[PDB]
Structure 1
Amino acid sequence: QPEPDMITIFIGTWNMGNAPPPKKITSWFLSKGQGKTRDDSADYIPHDIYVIGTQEDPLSEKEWLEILKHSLQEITSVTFKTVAIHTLWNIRIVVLAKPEHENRISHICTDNVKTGIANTLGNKGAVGVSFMFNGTSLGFVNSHLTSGSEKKLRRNQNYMNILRFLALGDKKLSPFNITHRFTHLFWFGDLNYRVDLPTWEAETIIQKIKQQQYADLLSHDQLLTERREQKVFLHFEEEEITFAPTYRFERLTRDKYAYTKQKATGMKYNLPSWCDRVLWKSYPLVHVVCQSYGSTSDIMTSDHSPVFATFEAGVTSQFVSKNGPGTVDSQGQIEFLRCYATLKTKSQTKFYLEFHSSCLESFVKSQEGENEEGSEGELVVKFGETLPKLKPIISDPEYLLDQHILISIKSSDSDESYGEGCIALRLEATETQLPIYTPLTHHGELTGHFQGEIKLQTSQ
């Protein structure tokens, strides 16, 4: 029975509005409703992995698991295995997988982050799950960010706290946050970004929604504008939105948006918004294709509609050779030529690199680089041809060309990372000097760039 080179992943996010669900929620898992929807001919084909994020979830873990499993069993006639479940307050994540994957999944981690301080600590934050699926690392984050149209900068701060402090994936990747630890990272939830238009325009917005004319609304969506301005979710992708705003509905219908200020809302307006979102970030040149992104039309217990997204995702096998794992394969090597880091820092410490990869027995520290002044004020750290030759555990090109090298540039004075990035080994040629490039980030913000050339030797 061959190991897969692709899987499909279902991501759901639903703010349940503290109400129990209706008796039937199958439309959610079938990607049916509005937006980019799944073809009917696929309805009985199970996804490999289902990741369900809820917010304002009033159910126990047991109660929700029973509903989810019975829902999937009805669609697919498969009894899914529970990989992980984790709840912070009323924010929950459930991962379910086909039983045939049970012995492909390992290294399961869960964590949560509570956002805010005093007043603002006690209901918002995030939960996450990570695991290995054969040779591929997968991370999943469900966040419930700060509410309210005038709090976009708080949401952005919530995002940075979650990616700094959520402890998932391989703890040996010490310089790297969750935005670098996984082959594929899915980040979803009630992100709570709003359509930034005047309150007076509420009825005009409703009109536009009834006409399925979303362009003049999406151009004011805070998440799209903040992402464009590099304020949040740097280097994440989102499918185009082609479904109506998923908040704020009158319960028990979808015919009415409930936007007007009420005592129950703290006298705040809730103009129709795309609060409920799915984004992802995958390592360079790894297959990932969004095959659905939409909202259900028939689940009406909450003031939000559920959102679904599904993905094809490339996966790799747990590779064994005669040599690695447990030794190097002298027929393999990775060389960096003429490499330099450009850093936004004002600091004047010396810097060194660390190379981390599961194709290495352990991470590799470089010598210090040579600091020069860039023309437009910046720090350029030159490595020349000084970088250590990396010795992969396996030389087979079917394995090595699918790997990645994480790079951290660290201060010699403090050993703190000033920037992290990632280089794919999925090269156009072996035994050939080829350009490489990654942006560098720290705490998920842009801090610089790393560029140079690579020369990869495989057994072929």
Structure 2
Amino acid sequence: QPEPDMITIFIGTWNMGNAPPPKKITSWFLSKGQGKTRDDSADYIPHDIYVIGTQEDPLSEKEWLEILKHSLQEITSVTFKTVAIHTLWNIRIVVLAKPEHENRISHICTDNVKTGIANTLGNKGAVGVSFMFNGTSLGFVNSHLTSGSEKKLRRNQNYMNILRFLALGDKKLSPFNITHRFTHLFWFGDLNYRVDLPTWEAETIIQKIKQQQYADLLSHDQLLTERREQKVFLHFEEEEITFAPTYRFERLTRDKYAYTKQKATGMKYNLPSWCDRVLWKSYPLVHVVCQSYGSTSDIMTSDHSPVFATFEAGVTSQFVSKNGPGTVDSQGQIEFLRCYATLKTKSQTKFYLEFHSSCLESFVKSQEGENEEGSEGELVVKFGETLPKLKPIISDPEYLLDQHILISIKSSDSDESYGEGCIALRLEATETQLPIYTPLTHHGELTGHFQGEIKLQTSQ
């Protein structure tokens, strides 16, 4: 039985509004309703992995697992296996996989982060799951961020706290946050960003939604505008939104948006908004294609509608050669030529690099670079031709060209990372000097760039 080179992944996010679900929720897992929907001809085809994020979830883990599994079994006639379940307060993530994947999945991790302090600590935060699927690392984050139209900055701060402090994936990748630890990272939830238009415009917004004219609403969506100004979710992608705002509905219908201020809302307006979102970040030149992104129309127990997204995701095999794992393969090498980092820092320590990759027996530390001043004020750290030759465990190009090198630039004085990035080995040529580039981030914010050339030797 061959190992797959692609899998499909279902992502669901639903703020359940503290109410039990209705008896049938299959439309969610079938990607039916509004937006980019899944073809009817696929309805019986199971996804490989289902990842369900809930917020304001009133159910026990047992109660929700029984609903989810019985739902999938009705759709597919497959009994899914539970990979992981993790709950923080009323924020929950469930990962289910087809039984054939049980032996392909390993290194299962769970974590949570509580956001805010005192007043603002007690119900918002995130849960996450990571695991390996054969040679591919997968991360999943369900976050419930701060509510309210005038708190976009708090939401951005919640995002940074979550990506700093959520402890998933390989702990040996110590300089790297979750935004670098995974081949594919999916981040979803009730992110709570709003359509920023005046309150007086509520009925106009409702009109536009009834006409399915979302353009003048999406141009005021705080998540898209904050992302465009590089305030949040730097280097993540989102599919185009082609479904109506998923919040705030009157329960038991979808015919009415309940936006007016009430004692129960803290006297806040809830203009119709895309609170419920799915974003992703995959390593460079790895296959990832969004095949659905939408909302259900027939699940009405909550003041939010469920959101679905599905993905094709490239995966790689566990690789064994006569040499690695357990030794190097002398027919392989990775050379960095003429490399330099450009950093935004005002500091003047020396810097060194660390190269981390599962194609190496362990991470590699460079010598210190040579600091120069850039023409527009910047620090440039030159490595020239000084960088250590990297010795991969396997030389076979079918393995090596699918790998990635994580880079951290660290202060000699503090050993703290000033910037992290990622280089794909999916090159146009081997034994050929080719340009490389990554932006560098720290705590998910842009701190610099790394560029140079690479020369990759494989056994072919």
TM-score in terms of structure 2 length: 1.00
TM-superposed deviation, 1:217 = 0.1
Runs of 4+ in 1 over 6 A off after TM superposition: none
Residue of structure 1 in register with 2:260 after alignment: 260
Deviation at 1:132, TM superposition (A): 0.1
* CA-to-aligned-CA distance 1:202-253 (integer Å, 9 cap, x gap): 0000000000000000000000000000000000000000000000000000
Measured against aligned partners, the alpha-carbon deviations of 1:173-229 in whole angstroms (never above 9, x if no partner) come to 000000000000000000000000000000000000000000000000000000000
Shift of 1:282: 0.1
The Cα shift of 1:330 comes to 0.2
Q: Report the CA distance between 1:105 and its aligned residue.
A: 0.1
Q: Distance in 1 between matches of 2:436 and 2:309?
A: 32
- Give the whole-Å Cα distance in 2 for the aligned partners of 1:394 and 1:320: 8
Per-residue deviation, 1:367: 0.1
- Distance in 2 (CA, whole Å) between partners of 1:318 and 1:285 is 19
1-structure distance, mates of 2:401, 2:160: 32
Per-residue deviation, residues 253-285 of structure 1 (Å, max 9, x unmatched) = 000000000000000000000000000000000
State the alpha-carbon separation in 2 of the partners of residues 192 and 172 from structure 1: 33
CA distance in 1, matches of 2:106, 2:33: 34
Question: Residue 422 of structure 1: CA displacement?
Answer: 0.0
Give a deviation string over 1:341-361, Cα, whole Å, max 9, x none.
000000000000000000000
Q: Deviations over 1:407-441 (max 9, x none)?
A: 00000000000000000000000000000000000
1:138 is displaced (CA, Å) by: 0.1
For 1:40 and 1:331, how far apart are their aligned partners in 2? 49
Taking the aligned partners of 1:434 and 1:376, their CA distance within structure 2 comes to 27
Question: What's the CA shift string for 1:363-409, capped at 9, x where partnerless?
Answer: 00000000000000000000000000000000000000000000000
Say yes or no: does 1:115 pair with 2:115.
yes
* 1:312 Cα offset (Å): 0.1
How far is the alpha carbon of 1:292 from its aligned partner?
0.0
CA distance in 2, matches of 1:202, 1:427: 51
Q: Distance in 1 between matches of 2:376 and 2:456?
A: 33
Give the CA deviation at 1:29. Answer: 0.0
Pairing of 1:56-455 with structure 2 (within 5 A):
56-455=56-455
Query: How far does the alpha carbon of each residue in 1:287-318 deviate from its partner, in whole angstroms, 9 at most, with x for none?
Result: 00000000000000000000000000000000
Secondary structure class of the residue paired with 1:113: strand
What CA distance in whole angstroms lies between the structure 1 residues aligned with 2:123 and 2:318? 40
The offset of 1:118, in angstroms, is: 0.0
CA shift, 1:72, in A, is: 0.1
- CA distance in 1 between partners of 2:384 and 2:240 (Å): 42
SS of the residue 2:162 aligns to: helix
- How far apart, in 2, do the equivalents of 1:373 and 1:218 lie? 42
Q: How far did residue 127 of structure 1 move? A: 0.0
Spell out, residue by residue over 1:99-139, the C-alpha distance to the aligned partner (whole angstroms, 9 max, x if none). 00000000000000000000000000000000000000000
CA distance in 1, matches of 2:373, 2:450: 16
Total equivalences in the alignment = 460
Work out the CA distance in 1 between the residues paired with 2:401 and 2:459. 11
Q: How far did 1:90 drift?
A: 0.1
CA–CA distance in structure 2, aligned partners of residues 174 and 130 of structure 1: 16
Aligned to 2:217, the other structure's residue is in SS state helix
% identity of equivalent residues: 100
Q: Cα RMSD (Å) of the superposition?
A: 0.1
Distance in 2 between residues matched to 1:161 and 1:225, nearest whole Å: 20
Secondary structure of 2:447's aligned partner: strand
Rounded Cα–Cα distance in structure 2 between residues aligned with 1:325 and 1:353: 24
* Whole-angstrom distance in 2 between the partners of 1:255 and 1:384: 64
Quick one: distance in 2 between partners of 1:226 and 1:378?
26
Offset, 1:77: 0.1
Residue 4 of structure 1, CA deviation: 0.1
TM-score, structure 1 length as denominator?
1.00
Q: Deviations over 1:29-80 (max 9, x none)?
A: 0000000000000000000000000000000000000000000000000000
Task: Note the C-alpha offset of 1:85.
Answer: 0.0
For 1:391, what is the secondary structure of its paired residue?
coil
Report the CA distance between 1:18 and its aligned residue: 0.0
Deviation at 1:168, TM superposition (A): 0.1
Q: CA deviation at 1:93?
A: 0.0
Q: Secondary structure at the match of 1:203?
A: helix
State the Cα deviation string for residues 139-190 of structure 1 (Å, max 9, x = none).
0000000000000000000000000000000000000000000000000000
- Structure 2 gaps, min length 5: none
Give secondary structure in 1 for the equivalent of 2:75. Answer: helix
